[PDB]
C-alpha cells in the first residue's frame, strides 16, 4: 500500500497549481494558518517543492484506487508534511494527520 515513487509527476502538480486548479481541506487551511501560510501560501510551498522533498506515495484499504503523494519541504516556518492527490485535473492538498 506504499510506493517509493510519486503517483503524479511534480511538473504536472505545479502546472495545476500555476493554473489555479487547487483545493485544500479545511483542516489543512487552519493548520497552514498556524505556520503563517494562507491558501496562496500553500500554493507557493507546492511550487517550491523539489523531487528531493518527496517522501512516499500511499493508498488505503478504504480508497484503494486513490494515491496520496507525501512531501516534506523544510521551510523557514519549519518542516511540513503535505499530502497531494490529483482528482480530475484538480490538485487536492492536505497535511499529515
Amino acid at each position: 500500500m506504499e510506493k517509493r515513487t510519486p503517483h503524479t509527476r511534480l511538473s504536472q502538480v505545479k502546472k495545476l497549481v500555476n493554473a489555479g486548479q487547487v483545493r485544500t481541506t479545511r483542516s489543512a487551511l487552519l493548520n497552514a494558518d498556524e505556520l503563517g501560510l494562507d491558501f496562496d501560501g500553500m500554493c507557493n510551498v507546492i511550487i517550491g517543492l523539489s523531487e528531493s522533498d518527496f517522501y512516499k506515495s500511499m493508498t488505503t484499504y478504504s480508497d484503494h484506487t486513490i494515491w496520496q503523494d507525501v512531501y516534506r519541504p523544510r521551510l523557514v516556518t519549519g518542516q511540513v508534511y503535505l499530502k497531494i492527490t490529483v482528482i480530475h485535473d484538480v490538485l487536492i492538498v492536505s497535511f499529515k494527520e
Binding site: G20, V22, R23, T24, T25, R26, S27, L29, L30, D33, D38, F39, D40, T60, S62, D63, I66, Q68, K83, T85, I87, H88, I92, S94, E97
Partner: protein, 70 residues
C-alpha cells in the same frame, strides 16, 4: 471523490454553519461553502471559499483578542 482524511465518505457540494472556538470563546461561522464529507466533518475548499472562511475566522479572532476580561 472520497474524503482525503477518512477515505470513505463521498464529498458533496454544500453550505454549513461551522462551530469555531478560540481562546475560550466560540462562534458559529455562517454559510461556509465547500465540498463536505458525508462521513466525517472534513471539507475541501477552493481559493475563494478558503479566503472567505479564513476572513470570518480572522474577524472572530480579532473580536476575541480585543475583548475585556473582567
Amino acid at each position: 471523490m472520497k474524503c482525503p482524511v477518512c477515505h470513505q465518505g463521498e464529498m458533496v457540494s454544500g453550505i454549513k454553519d461551522i462551530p469555531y472556538t478560540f481562546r475560550g470563546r466560540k462562534t458559529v461561522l455562517k454559510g461556509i461553502h465547500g465540498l463536505y464529507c458525508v462521513h466525517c466533518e472534513e471539507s475541501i475548499m477552493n481559493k475563494e471559499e478558503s479566503d472567505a472562511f479564513m476572513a470570518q475566522v480572522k474577524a472572530f479572532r480579532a473580536s476575541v483578542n480585543a475583548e475585556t476580561v473582567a
